[PDB]
Amino acid sequence: DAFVGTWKLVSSENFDDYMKELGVGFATRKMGGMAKPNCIISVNGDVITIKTESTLKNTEISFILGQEFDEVTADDRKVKSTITLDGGVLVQVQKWDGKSTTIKRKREDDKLVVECVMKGVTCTRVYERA
């Protein structure tokens, strides 16, 4: 849809703080902090795939909107994830150990804007088409 494409990270604010609030240790925060991943989003019927590719790590999720799935995150959390579409925004929630974080992906002009929230910390990442 609006989301399908190959996207490259162009900007990020507060991602270290976000990773810290998730419990990510220093070595992994250091690897994530200056990573400039690509995000490849595709759809085949009911099934949406999001690949995230960077020099040191590749991850992938495939899902159906509104159906919970098990996910291993890039920082090795084992989470239960659910993704829905709300007003054109893809809203992902991850739940583990009684905690939750939300990742919202939205299309704005030329950009794919991703907002990640954990407790009082909000991170914003912007991608542009590769």
Ligand X SMILES: Fc1cc2nc[nH]c2cc1Cl
Kindly give, in sequence order, each residue whose CB lies less than 8 Å from that of residue 107, ignoring residues fewer than 6 positions away: 2, 3, 88, 113
82 and 91 Cβ atoms separated by less than 8 Å: no
Residue 74 binds ligand MYR (CB under 6 A): yes
What residues are designated binding site for a fatty acid?
A: 125-127
Q: Is 112 in the site for ligand X (CB under 6 A)?
A: no
52: left (phi over 0), alpha (psi -120 to 50) or beta: beta
Question: How many residues bind to ligand MYR according to rule CB under 6 A?
Answer: 17
122 binds, among ligand X, ligand MYR, none (CB under 5 to 8 A by kind): none
Part in contact with ligand MYR (CB under 6 A); list of ranges 41-49, 60-68, 69-77, 83-91? 69-77
- Tell me if residue 17 falls in helix, strand or coil: helix
Query: Which of ligand MYR, ligand X, none does residue 58 bind (CB under 5 to 8 Å by kind)?
Result: ligand X
Residue that is written with structure tokens 């579409």 in the block: 85
Q: Applying CB under 6 A, which residues contact ligand X?
A: 32, 35, 37, 52, 54, 57-59, 74
